[PDB]
Amino acid sequence: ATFEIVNRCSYTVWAAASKGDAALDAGGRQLNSGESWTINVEPGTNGGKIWARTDCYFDDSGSGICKTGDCGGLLRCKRFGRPPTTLAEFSLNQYGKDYIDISNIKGFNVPMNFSPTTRGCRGVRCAADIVGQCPAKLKAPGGGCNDACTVFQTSEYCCTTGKCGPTEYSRFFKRLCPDAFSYVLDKPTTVTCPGSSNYRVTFCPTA
């Protein structure tokens, strides 16, 4: 499947694409404002994510740090990123269908739009100014708005027991973006698309 990853933000992002134990395509690439990086994700990829990293430094080997979404210091992500990360999440060719979402379970750093570029299904977006509105106790000094699991490490916020309900904090994310996951047991905002659909993810889709 083809994912086109567009940076509409006014600032540079370092895009990332991983399934947790490996890269998807090259794993990470810088996107200046307006740039696009096109990737190929293997059919059948289950549990893939794309995200943006902010305020990154990399040496000539591709080693360094990012203030949000750092994946073990690598330009070319093998692993998931350090919260806070707005996540575009997808499992493809799962019994004939593709499943996509955006999640704020791991916080929010950059606004995003996740949309098919083929027919049969609708996109989802989390565009609101979550960083600007972020509860004081959730604010990430490095930038972004952490998830309460990250901050507070409780069974309730992190759904450790598979039993958890909404919280003031999940509800904050949910108010700003009702079409993204806010906690582990949120009513699902997963969209079913045709198997082998294609997609575009856009950072800062409105601004």
UniProtKB/Swiss-Prot annotation:
Cell compartment(s), UniProt: Cytoplasmic vesicle
CDD domains in alphabetical order: TLP-P
Annotated keywords: Cytoplasmic vesicle, Disulfide bond, Signal, Taste-modifying protein
Domain of life: Eukaryota
Entry's Gene Ontology cellular component terms: cytoplasmic vesicle
This protein's record includes keyword Nucleotidyltransferase: no
Keyword Transcription regulation: no
InterPro entries linked: Osmotin/thaumatin-like_sf, Thaumatin, Thaumatin_CS
Pfam families xrefs: Thaumatin
Disulfide cysteine pairs (residue numbers): 9-204, 56-66, 71-77, 121-193, 126-177, 134-145, 149-158, 159-164
Family in the record: Belongs to the thaumatin family.
PANTHER family the UniProt entry points to: OS03G0233200 PROTEIN
Function noted in UniProt: Taste-modifying protein; intensely sweet-tasting. It is 100000 times sweeter than sucrose on a molar basis.
Protein name: Thaumatin I
